[PDB]
Structures are given as structure tokens and as C-alpha cells.
Amino acid sequence: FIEVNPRVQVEHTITEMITGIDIVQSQLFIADGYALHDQLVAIPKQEDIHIHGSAIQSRITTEDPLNNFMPDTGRVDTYRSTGGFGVRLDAGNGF
Amino acid sequence: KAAFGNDVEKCVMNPKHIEVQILGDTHGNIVHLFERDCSIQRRHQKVVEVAPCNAITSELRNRICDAAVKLMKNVDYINAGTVEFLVEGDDFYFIEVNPRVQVEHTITEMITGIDIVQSQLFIADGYALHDQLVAIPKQEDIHIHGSAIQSRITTEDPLNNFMPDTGRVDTYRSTGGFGVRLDAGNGFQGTVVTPFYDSLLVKLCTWGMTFEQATRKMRRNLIEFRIRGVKTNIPFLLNVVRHPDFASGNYNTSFIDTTPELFKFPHIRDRGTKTLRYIGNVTV
Amino acid sequence: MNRIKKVLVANRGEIAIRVMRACTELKIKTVAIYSQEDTGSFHRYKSDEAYLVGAGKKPIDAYLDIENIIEIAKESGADAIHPGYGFLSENIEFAR
């Protein structure tokens, strides 16, 4: 053991992708009090929770590695994202 | 004669349009990637495609799929292609065969986990389906994870009877998040749509463990989209996706047309645009 | 990946792009083709190379100039051609 985070984490996406379970939707159901295994919440019994595939996440940031990762600033004149099979994007300050 | 170079079967009542995706290598290995339900259609034109089909029994599904396999095995079929079927009650019947990738191949990718087009390329290089690099499992090992719905945002305007609007897209803001895939067509901020080619801007597919889950994500995504400069079919797709008979999962080819409400659209004011009209007016 | 080092994408639009994405994911060079009316379509910028095809041709006819495409395919060094869907996807003469 090293630490415990009582919150959503940045990297929760990948776990969503391999389990199939929408974490944040679940967070909201739980705060409304529903049980994990209710019909609506649709989280399966632990025995029934499996891994599909694997998922890698990387965060594109304005940290510039030539300038020792000093977050560059300014206006984004051109932003063209990607997509396709097996690609998810969670947009931040990116338009 | 007008449509094609060249100038009769028993009509059917309220069928369900079901396709099966097939992959075969140069080494006589053939596999199916399960069905897709394209029963939602307008004047017999596919609109919203869903996989897998929720409303059929697994026993049936396998029968249909195995039927498709038997056929493509019989022809020693190579690479990717699709066998279409029409389905009534518990009887199914062959309709057509597409020896190519289909537009709606995405959803099958999403439930199987198998990259079809990557596979197409491996197969054309000749590798066996079950090679290490190609990593397609034995049929027994191919399963369904969740379900996925695909809808194609186009410039067809439903007020103008789906005449593909033309022009420049001044604002195009796509969506994303868990269980959302986008396959971009002619859909970036600068682009101008010509009328010469088809109307499609972007293909929006969403996935969920349960189809009811996926439908939710589709709803949100469709609303979230901001496209300006051209009319689109979004408000139409929203009405079909909102419709309760769609969420039920029991629909047939005759589901559109039979339901006129979908063609009635909310009279939405954007306070915002009208505000800019005023401001712009008095400014000039 | 073995005997395909480079591939031509004998199509436009969404489907063209999907293929390119696949190739690039497999370290395969890609070549696009665009009609005169499609000098603007962003599928042409998404490839490693691109050439105009249907010169003087009616816009739909342009992506069906079989012979042209092969010349383009041969000049490019394209080991293979992916026709996507629609257009020459099902055309026998081309396949042959």
C-alpha cells in the first residue's frame, strides 16, 4: 500500500474502457443511493466483471519539452483532433 | 434504367433487416462477426444502424450467422464482406450480398473488438485470420461486448425534404467522451460542402453495455453537436432516437413512414442568434 | 506486416480516411486520390501522398477512371489498392 484517493481520478477513462462500466454515471447513481447491482445502474456482480482488451491514455498538454516543460501559453489558431476505432477523446481546453 | 444500366419476389410484411459481417482469409478460414440491425429505414434507405440485434433469440442469431458462414464457405470467400438477411418471426431469408466494407462496419467493430479494416489489410497481405499479429480469435472465442448504435450526421435538411444543403461550415464542434466514436467525413471548420458527392459530414457511433445505455449516449452526443453554416439531419435523428418504440428495440422496416411524428420538429428559438441580429443591425 | 509496403485508397471522404488510419496504424504508406471538385476534401490531406484523378471528368465519373487510377497506382509504387465502398468497390473490370 502507498496512498488512497477518495475521488475520480484523471486516468479513470482507461478503466471505463476495459470494464465497460461508465464510472461517472455510476458516481451519480450512487450519490442518489441506488445499489450497484440495480437494474438501472447495471453494474454486474464482481464475478461477472471482466477485462475486455487494454487501453492506454496520454494527456496532450502545452508543456514544451524544449523549454523544460514550461506550459506554453497563447491562442490555439488550429486544433484538429483525431478519431476512429478504439479512440476516445476527453476534451479539456481544446477547441 | 435511370439509376443503373439495366431495366420479382414475394412482398414481405414488417420484416427486420439483419446483416452479418464476414471475414475470410486466403487460407480457407472464415469467421462471422455477428449481426447488425438496419431495420430503421426511410423509404427503404438505411438511417440508424444498431448492433447486435436485441430483439432476436441467440439460437436464431446463430442460425442466421451460420447460414451466412455456410454460404461464404461454399464460395471459398476471401477478405471482408456482408450477407444481408430479412427476418420475420422465427423465419429468416437471404436478401443480398455485399463483397466489401460497409458504412455501418463500425458498430460491429465496437461489439466484437475486432478492427475490421486492419484485418482487411492483413488478409490482402495473406496472413491467416488466427495469426499472432492479426489476433482474430477462433469463432468460439468471438463474443459480443455491449451494443453500439451508429447514426450519420448529414447535410440533408428535413424541412426542405432532405435536400442536401450546401455551403460553408462556419462552426463545427464535435463531441466525445466514454463510449463515443467519431469517423470524420467532410467535417472540419473550414470545409465547404459541394452538392456533387454525398451529404455525409460525420459518422457518430456510441456504445454501451446495454443498448439502453448506448441510446442515452447517442441522445447526449446528438444534442451536444454544434454545426453551423448548413442544415443537417440531426433534429430528425433526435426524434427517431427519442421515440419510445426505438428505445424498445422492437421495430421493423416499416417503422419510419408508419410514424409521422418524427417528421414534426420543435420550433426552437435561439435567443442568442436573434440578439446578434439586433446588435449587428444597429451597428450598421 | 509483409508484402504491402504502400497502399492506394481508391476512394474519397469518410471511408478513405478510415483506411488511411488503418494503414498508418500498420506502418503502411498511403496514397490518396481526389477529383477536381475534391481538391478541398480533407481526406486528401490525411494521406502521405496525393494526386488528382478524374481530369476533365464529370465529378462522379472522376473516381471511376479505372485506367487512370492504375497509372497513378503504378507511378506511386503502390503495392495494393483499397477501393473502400461504393464507386469501384464492386466493379469487376477494375478488380480484374
Side-chain angles (χ1 to χ4, degrees), chain C residues 21-35 37-41 43-45 47-50:
Chain C
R21 305 207 171 167
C23 308
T24 301
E25 296 162 339
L26 302 179
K27 325 222 70 149
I28 304 178
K29 300 282 90 156
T30 86
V31 192
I33 59 134
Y34 53 95
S35 61
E37 294 73 18
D38 254 10
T39 337
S41 178
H43 82 90
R44 144 256 240 288
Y45 313 109
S47 66
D48 305 295
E49 328 170 20

Side-chain angles (χ1 to χ4, degrees), chain B residues 100 103 105 109 115 117-118 120-122 124-125 127 181 183-185 188 194 196-198 203, chain C residues 1-2 4 12 14 17-19 22-23 25-26 28 35 37-38 40 59-60 63 82 84-85 89:
Chain B
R100 34 153 263 242
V103 190
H105 77 265
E109 283 183 333
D115 183 313
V117 192
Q118 260 172 248
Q120 290 203 286
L121 296 173
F122 284 140
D125 211 30
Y127 287 70
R181 153 168 189 181
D183 267 64
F188 68 131
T194 73
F196 311 125
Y197 304 157
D198 93 309
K203 275 207 253 148
Chain C
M1 218 241 37
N2 206 104
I4 303 94
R12 65 181 308 270
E14 171 256 0
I17 302 175
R18 168 95 193 79
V19 175
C23 308
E25 296 162 339
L26 302 179
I28 304 178
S35 61
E37 294 73 18
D38 254 10
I60 318 277
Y63 289 96
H82 192 134
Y85 62 70
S89 51

Side-chain angles (χ1 to χ4, degrees), chain A residues 40-44 46-69 71-76 78-89:
Chain A
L40 184 53
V41 182
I43 307 178
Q46 190 75 240
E47 325 105 38
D48 297 320
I49 291 191
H50 318 150
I51 295 171
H52 200 329
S54 86
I56 304 151
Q57 184 209 250
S58 35
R59 308 172 273 161
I60 321 298
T61 53
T62 65
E63 336 179 291
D64 179 2
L66 272 55
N67 187 26
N68 203 317
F69 301 79
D72 193 355
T73 32
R75 173 196 162 79
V76 176
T78 77
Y79 173 92
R80 223 100 91 182
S81 47
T82 133
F85 181 42
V87 183
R88 153 168 189 181
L89 307 144

